Amino acid sequence: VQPLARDAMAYVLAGGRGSRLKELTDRRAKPAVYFGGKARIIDFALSNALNSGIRRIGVATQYKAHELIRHLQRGWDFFRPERNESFDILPASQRVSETQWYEGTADAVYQNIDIIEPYAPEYMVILAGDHIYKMDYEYMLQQHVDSGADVTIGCLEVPRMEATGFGVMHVNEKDEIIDFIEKPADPPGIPGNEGFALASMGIYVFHTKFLMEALRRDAADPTSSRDFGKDIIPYIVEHGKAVAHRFADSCVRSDFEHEPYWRDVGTIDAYWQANIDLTDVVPDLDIYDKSWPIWTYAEITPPAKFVHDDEDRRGSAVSSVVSGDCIISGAALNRSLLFTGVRANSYSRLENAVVLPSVKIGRHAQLSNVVIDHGVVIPEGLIVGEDPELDAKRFRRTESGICLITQSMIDKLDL
Amino acid sequence: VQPLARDAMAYVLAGGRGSRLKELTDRRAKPAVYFGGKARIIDFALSNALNSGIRRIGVATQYKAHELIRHLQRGWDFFRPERNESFDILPASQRVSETQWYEGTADAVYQNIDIIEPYAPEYMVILAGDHIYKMDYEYMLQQHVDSGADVTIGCLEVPRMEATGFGVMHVNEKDEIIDFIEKPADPPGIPGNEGFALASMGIYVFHTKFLMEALRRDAADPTSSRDFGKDIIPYIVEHGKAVAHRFADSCVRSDFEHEPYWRDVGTIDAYWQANIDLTDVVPDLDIYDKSWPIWTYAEITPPAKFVHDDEDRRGSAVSSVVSGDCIISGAALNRSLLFTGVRANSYSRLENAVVLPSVKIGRHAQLSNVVIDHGVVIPEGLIVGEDPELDAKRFRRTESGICLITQSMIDKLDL
Amino acid sequence: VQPLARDAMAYVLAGGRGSRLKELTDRRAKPAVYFGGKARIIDFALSNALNSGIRRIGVATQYKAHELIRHLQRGWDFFRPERNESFDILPASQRVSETQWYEGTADAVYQNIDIIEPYAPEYMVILAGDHIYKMDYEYMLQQHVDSGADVTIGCLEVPRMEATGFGVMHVNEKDEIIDFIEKPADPPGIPGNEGFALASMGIYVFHTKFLMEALRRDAADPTSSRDFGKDIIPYIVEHGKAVAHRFADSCVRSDFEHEPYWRDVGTIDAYWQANIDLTDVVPDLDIYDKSWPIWTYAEITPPAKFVHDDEDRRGSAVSSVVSGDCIISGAALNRSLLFTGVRANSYSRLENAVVLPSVKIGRHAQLSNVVIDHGVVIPEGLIVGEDPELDAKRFRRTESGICLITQSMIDKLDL
Amino acid sequence: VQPLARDAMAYVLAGGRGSRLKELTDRRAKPAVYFGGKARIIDFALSNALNSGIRRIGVATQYKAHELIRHLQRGWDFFRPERNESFDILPASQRVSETQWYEGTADAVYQNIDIIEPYAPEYMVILAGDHIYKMDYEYMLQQHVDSGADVTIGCLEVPRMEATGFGVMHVNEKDEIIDFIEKPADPPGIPGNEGFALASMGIYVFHTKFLMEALRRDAADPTSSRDFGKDIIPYIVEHGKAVAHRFADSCVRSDFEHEPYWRDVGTIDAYWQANIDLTDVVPDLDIYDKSWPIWTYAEITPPAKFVHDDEDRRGSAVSSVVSGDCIISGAALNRSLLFTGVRANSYSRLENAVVLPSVKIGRHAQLSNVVIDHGVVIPEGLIVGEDPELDAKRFRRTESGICLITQSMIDKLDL
């Protein structure tokens, strides 16, 4: 009768550096990276927990967390303990130990047992905080209880050649995990469906009592790298009962999303592509859906504005997504995504451009196939996208020709 | 030393019907009308109160106030009494008398003395809630105390020809009010500056104890129409000391506003004009200003989206202001202001259009010189602005050719 | 898999006058009456909705609603539409019609169909807002869908002699409702257990569109008094499928409540008793429970204080419940319940006293067996509970000797 | 005309360890210590800022700050940047530098200039976060601008023998500071009033642009201990213009406070004394004042309860201050102060006790002259205050005989 989410706590792992995002994560952890016009990556897992009815949330942070923690303080501020709600931001710090850094994803939870236990949740839902996806976690909770698993593991069903970069679960007829392989060159297929493999999402459901004991087990073992994927879960698949949960069974698709949507935006190319795809006529991700909404930190913002329309300049956007507090003054935008606060000035042009909040585009600048970091001021007349060798020397250039542009790159600029 | 706003309470008169806005105010009071892709009209006086440091606000409502009350409840919800802050919504209702109607603007304060006296504010700032303007009321409060006035009245300095439509204050050299005239055919000129007259704003500062006594006198006087403008102030200019405060002295102008901005948007033409002027290259009102911000009710909204770009259709906006959650799909917008939630569809065209929230524009519709009421669905292929005779039969058409369009008029439609 | 409350809207009927509470409800509807030391009666149903997972709430108000509506505005302010939550305060007002009065409890929902249908909830949970009880509405929802009922009705299982004051449901062996009788002299018994009758709590679960259809037909029938209990529900038991849900199956009992707790505090004796019973060593209602908490409007308040300990005066409380911001200065309290803000002064005595917020007790006053209304100032030396004849002349005195004391009564006082 | 607080930012130094409070500050910094029944010490400076109209606040933390940060996050959560309000929590950490420690109170501001400069406040109000006092900083701001000072320093006026423990300002006839001495053996007296000296409160007003340069200068000086009182202020007194502001000129006294109140609660005795003094008939600090309120983090909490009244046990409090959610079950309290959540059980007695939140007193325990730390569980039958030598072996006992009791101390216990 009662939904199990009433008795669950979501615990989000948000310490991931995202080192392949290069300068995009030099000053902020990957869960803090802006995505899709407004939110940050972490808001997706957070919103999944909220919309699934989980109203105790803990977030473990580590690497470069000041921007992430400030976002969480200001955006996720509406939980009240009187209502059996809680939002705990849990950085590694001189608190219960000297340390100041978590030893691994397991240690991220283990060090905060004294926070969890007063709440006495029946269940723990462990979440990667660095992916973009919508999912109703009540489904996994139900499967976990009914299957008697020690751990239920969220898995994507992917073509085996795509699984070579994931931690892959090897399952039997009834989706019980026989073995776990980190990045198999030839991923094991699903029995009776070997064109596909189950790739771990880093979503784990436990009974709290079991998890605490296993965290304590783990923390005593010197063999352990203190990691869910490499230590906790492999021990259980061997000695206990681990079961896979398939993302397709619990993904929340809107009427305007043709397939289950999950993205890890792990490379500059992948991050550019996921954002720019939102400019499509029929985008894979429906950012206009209100049935499974993404909460985030947002301020009252004025509308977007388009000015100038003469023989020489026209401020206008085609095949583009433009946020509030954007003033497109005499600037031509095509196939671009603009976050809030952008100022694009006369005779400039943006094409195939992902523009993070509060960027300024100087008069006459022309930028194609770029990601412009938050707050960058683009000098008047800067050309990007016309000279690959010049662009690669000045900026971080992808082999597929995307330039990531940061303020530090701009400050160094000559010819 | 201490600012006088700490000891003031703002009391906003928000019962105004705005009869000349015709069907724009059929189901909402004038202070509830949307303005500027920014806020509702009432939010300007409320934000002026807030930014001036007044932490006690009351709002008297009357004519058709459901939409207005719900906006106040949801938008103006962050005052806490334990911080000596209060926000009181005061509709005429069976709480102290049967009535269910306020007899006038003086009565709207008078019936609520039992709300005011427990707060014991030293000063009352009585405000009209149906005008768009920015003003720092600390200045009026200083002038009032130092002048020793019984009432201090905010006044616009305007050419006398334009003053024929206002309550007009006749003053001596000291800016003390020696007479008041309701709509003078020949407005009294300011001494030494005869080309201008002081036109009342309906902004009044009193010592609370004095006002409470003047309201009690007024509730007894059978010759009184129970109106601040026509009863309270004239009695004081007669028997006490009334002093005029000029708008230009305390108007808050941003660096991008060439002159003090005040608008009463009292007619459809004036409402259309003030909104459409926000699409100018250098607008009179700076809605991007952050130094004197306008607080309002706002939700997390997705960005605006423009799609399609081929031989036959292109979704794009030129010389226009576009709010979030607008999808401009194959539609051409020019010199238009769109509030949130608009959906404009393929081959439609808007020009010189003020489009309130959640309007839908059907394919192939072409509309020029229009105000479209909140939530209207414009039928595919509807043409407005081509045939004044037909437009005037179907719609509320001003002499200058603005068509106000409501869903009730759409529902009646044929050829 | 997904809880049904996600898809439900709770709709609280809060127009009740509670006329048998006499002067306690002369300026406030019954759901606004204070109960238990802090909350108001309406907060119980509201908190049940919230704790059950229902995040769309409507509250219909009518009789003397200013205090109620201010309570809802300031207390129930944390719902956000972006999260698919809503809290709508729905007074009878000149809005969709002139009226200024709901024709009945069915009409209170019918008039507001235009507010419900934009939310399109799958289920409606219609609640009476004038009872004190705790209940998980997910159980009723499941029974309602699983049974295929047209309406599921919440029912107290009570001894038949106690059911003569209730509207009683006659059921068959499957708890299907075969008849409904308003206040039967000899209430029909439950089959196979005739010592008990099922007494209607005025809680009704419907499929939304079935209810919209029953509401519309009811508004059309001139036979109808426009009432859930005597119009909607009788027709369904006759023409459709009405099923009873027993309170015991879904009451939320803390470990410290020996039985399911339900109270209608319909009379001054019952209100006094239910409150004073909280001073017991083992109270029937556990106001210290945090597993099913009651949300309300609460301000930051200083602690309670006890002053003076000498020959002739000692401020102290025995067998009593004392809220914050109470200063017990030389006053003896025994078996009393004090809401916040009380000032009891030297040489006064309270026994068997229910004391609503911000009451003042003057020096030397002695009061026994009383309910003291919000904000009453008790004159120095007043004696209540000594002389029944004099007490009944001065105050509202019950047959059993409880005096309800209002400020209007105090104002009239001599000897 | 315009108050100066509109353009100030308050910056609270809250990294103080409070070493002399011993185990009371072993797991929290001094600003996080509970005081007076509800608030925490830091809430006084924060409330002074808020009530003075300062809407931008920064709080620098360092030593053991988890509890403090969580308090700030949950309690001080109502500032919105759109209203030009801001509340920044600034712990030393990896962000702008590796360090993760502040080199001193000046470096606590210096490391965060990049947070300050975007706001561009005209004035900085630097505050000590570890003192209990009320003060209207608009007075100090007015004095600063009008005097032309480089730094205006808040100062207590105390008898000279008392000043020997303070940093003392030597002034001339016009309250200009001519020397500064750290703990003078013989404190320089006030000219014309040699019985008194000016003791620095560690409150400093600057022009922001001045301060930013003085900090940059300080961050270059290798002879600098990076301290406001030790390096910044003496430098200015020497080469610039430092002016003293006397606390009596801007202290906020309620009508029930016989003198300006300031306490630093630096020792266990001083902490115990300031709290127990609140049980007085006429307390020096008025915690019931509403004119200058102290905001803090508070939850909805049930009332206090007193039970049992027979010949062997009576739950009651005399000359005591008792917070909500305290159940006094057969326990006798006298001259004690209880924070929320205490459970005192049958036959126990508390005298002269300061009892922090959520303490449980076991049956038959008898405790006199104690501070009991947050959450301590006192064993049944424990006796404290009877045997000085035993009490000092078990607990932290002051020379004056106050025992500080923590759970670690209880956990060691036998006889």
Residue numbers in the entry:
A (entry chain G), B (entry chain H), C (entry chain O), D (entry chain P): 6 to 420
From the paper:
We hypothesize that a sulfate ion previously found in the crystal structure reveals a part of the regulatory site mimicking the presence of the phosphoryl moiety of the activator Fru6P. Ser72 interacts with this sulfate ion and, if the hypothesis is correct, Ser72 would affect the interaction with Fru6P and activation of the enzyme. Here, we report structural, binding, and kinetic analysis of Ser72 mutants of the A. tumefaciens ADP‐glucose pyrophosphorylase. By X‐ray crystallography, we found that when Ser72 was replaced by Asp or Glu side chain carboxylates protruded into the sulfate‐binding pocket. They would present a strong steric and electrostatic hindrance to the phosphoryl moiety of Fru6P, while being remote from the Pyr site. In agreement, we found that Fru6P could not activate or bind to S72E or S72D mutants, whereas Pyr was still an effective activator. These mutants also blocked the binding of the inhibitor AMP.
The allosteric regulation of ADP–glucose pyrophosphorylase is critical for the biosynthesis of glycogen in bacteria and starch in plants. The enzyme from Agrobacterium tumefaciens is activated by fructose 6‐phosphate (Fru6P) and pyruvate (Pyr). The Pyr site has been recently found, but the site where Fru6P binds has remained unknown. We propose that the ADP‐glucose pyrophosphorylase from A. tumefaciens have two distinct sites for Fru6P and Pyr working in tandem to regulate glycogen biosynthesis.
